[PDB]
């Protein structure tokens, strides 16, 4: 029913490691990685492919999918070929395979055992724009990074090194996903810094600070305009479904006109404009009207150069420019005469 409760149950299934269990798991993982590198040395194959194969057989055929980094599409066929190629190796070499498998299994068990930590850390990041479950999952990604990067040699407990990567992943997630209009992480940092600065400033000023005071507190490079624009780009959008009035019958989006699609008046005006221009078309001769339509882009929509209309009508560019000039001139005279195209100039 409640997804969080359900997940907390599934987490409550796997029991917490002891110091020895943790050390052994970490050790098996590390030695497993070493073994994969050794198998890469022996076989002369790609360590990543080998790792994906060992992980494939450990996880089973229940999960097999093409890895973005891998060169070959990963399917039961290829993993069977590679597995059999790994079965083809001498006892001391074939040993490293067992080391690798044990490594993967240890990795899985390590993560699964440490899933509680992620929750305990993520519970404090709520209200920051991501759901609890999302924070948990991103924190889990962090946990995975921590597992693959851990060194048991340092004798530090796993939680210490894990917490860093977990917080890292949660915060990266918050910075990356939380805005409908996405903002770069460094810019999010700058914005949050501006917020904290303004909040401290207001905490000592007994009022909200001006742009100038914030600019002062931000240091050199920061003036009022920079603070103002930074606050401008930080603005988040509002819902179109935002309710208006005490009833349920009015949306905020109902008050917003469409500026894109031309109005009936605008459309009709463009229509009468085209029709009237064609009047003056039949007016000027065929050639000068066509030259004007080519140069102004009424024909294909592009505006031709003098050399193009000149090569088209078979005259010099000077000539075509001259007939364009006289065309425009006759149009000017006729326009002064009939005052027809004046009203379309607003």
């Amino acid at each position: 029913s409640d997804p969080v409760r359900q997940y907390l149950h599934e987490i409550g299934q796997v029991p917490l490691l002891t110091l020895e269990e943790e050390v052994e798991l970490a050790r098996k993982v590390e030695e497993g990685m070493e073994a994969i590198k050794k198998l890469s040395e022996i076989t002369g194959l790609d360590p990543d492919l080998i790792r994906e194969v060992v992980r494939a057989k450990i996880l089973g055929s229940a999960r097999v999918r093409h890895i973005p980094g891998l060169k070959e599409t990963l399917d039961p066929k290829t993993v069977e070929e590679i597995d059999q190629k790994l079965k083809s190796l001498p006892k001391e070499h074939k040993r490293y395979l067992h080391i690798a498998r044990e490594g993967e299994a240890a990795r899985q068990h390590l993560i699964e055992a440490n899933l509680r930590l992620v929750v305990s850390i993520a519970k404090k990041y709520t209200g920051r724009g991501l759901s609890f479950l999302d924070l948990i999952q991103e924190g889990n990604q962090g946990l995975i990074r921590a597992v693959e990067k851990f060194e048991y040699k340092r004798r530090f407990k796993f939680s210490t090194y894990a917490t860093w990567w977990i917080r890292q992943a949660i915060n990266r997630a918050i910075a990356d996903q939380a805005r409908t209009i996405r903002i770069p992480v460094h810019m999010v940092e700058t914005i949050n810094k501006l917020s904290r600065t303004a909040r401290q400033l207001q905490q000592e000023l007994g009022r909200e600070p001006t742009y100038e005071e914030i600019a002062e507190a931000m240091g050199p490079g920061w003036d009022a305009k920079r603070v103002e624009e930074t606050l401008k780009i930080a603005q988040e959008p509002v819902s179109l479904e935002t309710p208006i009035g005490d009833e349920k019958d009015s949306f905020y989006g109902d008050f917003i006109p469409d500026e894109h699609l031309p109005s009936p008046v605008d459309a009709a005006t463009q229509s009468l404009l085209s029709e009237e221009l064609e009047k003056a078309l039949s007016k000027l001769s065929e050639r000068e009207a066509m030259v004007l339509k080519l140069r102004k882009g009424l024909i294909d929509g592009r505006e031709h150069t003098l050399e193009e209309v000149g090569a088209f009508f078979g005259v010099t560019r000077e000539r075509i420019r001259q007939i364009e000039n006289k065309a425009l001139r006759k149009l000017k005279y006729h326009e002064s005469r009939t005052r027809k195209l004046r009203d379309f100039l607003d």
């Binding site: 359900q6 999918r65 993560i111 999952q137 889990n140 004798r155 603005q235 509002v238």
Partner: protein, 508 residues
């Protein structure tokens, strides 16, 4: 209705509360065999798929009542405070101390009254060496300094004049040594007193016996073989690289560590005994020791009558998963079925694809003639859906979404209002939730994430799709941060008084 699954059940499978089984591979839960479309809990699926096992704590200072690799029956106490709830192969977890019994084969002399000595070519442990009517003083036949080496029972004297030993005497049980360590002894002074019956210690056996008769006495040169124990302490950061009862030689390492100086290396030939484990692991499994190269690696799943190790000699007894132990040099098969039981809309889509419509129509038709009214009713209700799909030409599995459509952007605008500020439809936020969760799912898959994580992610993905299509239909309605207002989904857009039909269609 189509798959004959009650609302609660479909809820359980889609939302990952329970597994549903496909191609069971003959699993057995509580004595009853498993057949397709059965509802398995998490514990049940884990017991069936990954096998049954448990681990028990050992309080500080207490040792094991059982041995590593030893089969165990339910109820059998592994310790004074520990009893195993199941049957299977017990295994040691993190032994605190390693005892090494060192093999020593040496030569030692003794002199006894001829009347007392019972003549034998060899002496087994505990076997009486001699029977003495009166107290007898064994005397030194050499001069030098005394090295007294005391076993559990029985002793050794080594006389060294130059620091080079000139004598070795054996003192079996019943002889109380009259000398201390490092004592200076001249020739013919008593090193011991023999009283009553004297016999071989339990620790040492006499392999060979030579005897020289001189005067009224016999001098026995005994070729003896015995083991001397040495304890080693293992710290939590150390691991044992040697199996229970392993023959080791000088230079070999019993226990590794972080740094070489804290390592445990074997000084001499001896057998290894693992004592005081941190915990004991009881697994239901079949053990298969191997003398040579093994054909199957760790994690592989195998049926009875399968190749394991030694070029096809040792094979598989039960169904299970293969754990190859290099430390103990044994292939261990934890007993588990290969059963395929999935969760979520993938399972459901599979079952949907596997429905033959005509067949089910026939079934329900034969069901419609039943005397019971309820059965005819339910069969009618089902046959209505079945025949709906049949007549329409729609594939049932299309009720599952592989590819979620995306509305044209102009219908879910992002628009700059008068003041230059932006206003936008909720559908964008819903779609963003969806895409974030999907992408995170693909990355978690590609990176080989554990099953709990992937399960959580899939559940969240389904709920995301739900929120997109009909929000608040199942579970809490998705809201924007800092607001209690439910987001407006496609269903909301369509229906109601404010819906598309009534607002924009039947009136304008």
């Amino acid at each position: 209705t189509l798959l004959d699954l009650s609302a609660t059940e479909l809820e359980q499978v889609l939302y990952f509360s329970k597994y549903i089984v496909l191609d069971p591979k003959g699993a057995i839960l509580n004595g009853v065999p498993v057949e397709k479309r059965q509802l398995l809990t998490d514990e049940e699926y884990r017991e069936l798929r990954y096998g049954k096992q448990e681990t028990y704590p050992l309080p500080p200072g207490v040792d094991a009542l059982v041995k590593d690799g030893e089969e165990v029956v339910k109820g059998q106490e592994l310790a004074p405070g520990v009893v195993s709830r199941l049957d299977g192969v017990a295994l040691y977890r993190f032994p605190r101390r390693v005892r090494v019994e060192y093999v020593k084969k040496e030569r030692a002399g003794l002199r006894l009254p001829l009347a007392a000595w019972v003549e034998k070519e060899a002496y087994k442990p505990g076997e009486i060496l001699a029977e003495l009517p009166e107290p007898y003083l064994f005397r030194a036949e050499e001069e030098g300094v005394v090295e007294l080496k005391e076993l559990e029972e029985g002793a050794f004297l080594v006389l060294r004049r130059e620091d080079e030993p000139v004598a070795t005497y054996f003192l079996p049980v019943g002889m109380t040594p009259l000398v201390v360590h490092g004592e200076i002894v001249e020739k013919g002074q008593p090193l011991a007193e023999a009283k009553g019956l004297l016999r071989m210690p339990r620790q040492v056996r006499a392999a060979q016996v030579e005897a020289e008769e001189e005067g009224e006495t016999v001098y026995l040169t005994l070729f003896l073989e015995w083991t001397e124990p040495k304890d080693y302490r293992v710290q939590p950061h150390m691991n044992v690289v040697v199996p229970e009862g392993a023959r080791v030689e000088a230079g070999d390492k019993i226990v590794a560590a972080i740094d070489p100086e804290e390592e445990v290396i074997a000084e001499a030939e001896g057998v290894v005994h693992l004592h005081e484990p941190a915990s004991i692991l009881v697994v239901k499994a079949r053990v298969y020791p191997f003398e040579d190269d093994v054909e199957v690696s760790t994690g592989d799943r195998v049926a009875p009558g399968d190749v394991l190790a030694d070029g096809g000699k040792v094979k598989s007894d039960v169904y299970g998963r293969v754990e190859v132990d290099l430390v103990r040099n044994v292939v261990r098969v934890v007993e588990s079925y290969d059963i395929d039981a999935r969760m979520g809309a993938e399972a459901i889509q599979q079952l949907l694809k596997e429905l033959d419509l005509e067949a089910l129509e026939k079934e329900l038709l034969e069901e419609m003639k039943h005397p019971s009214r309820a059965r005819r009713a339910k069969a009618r209700k089902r046959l209505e859906v079945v025949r709906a799909f049949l007549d329409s030409g729609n594939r049932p599995e299309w009720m599952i979404l592989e590819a979620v459509p995306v509305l044209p952007p102009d219908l879910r605008p992002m628009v700059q209002v008068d003041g230059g500020r932006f206003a936008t439809s909720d559908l964008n936020d819903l779609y963003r939730r969806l895409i974030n969760r999907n992408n995170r799912l693909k990355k978690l898959l590609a990176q080989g994430a554990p099953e709990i994580i992937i399960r959580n992610e899939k559940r969240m993905l389904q709920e995301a799709v739900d929120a997109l299509l009909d929000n608040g239909r199942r579970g809490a309605p998705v809201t924007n941060p800092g607001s209690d207002r439910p987001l407006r989904s496609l269903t909301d857009i369509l229906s109601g008084k404010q819906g598309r039909f009534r607002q924009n269609l039947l009136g304008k």
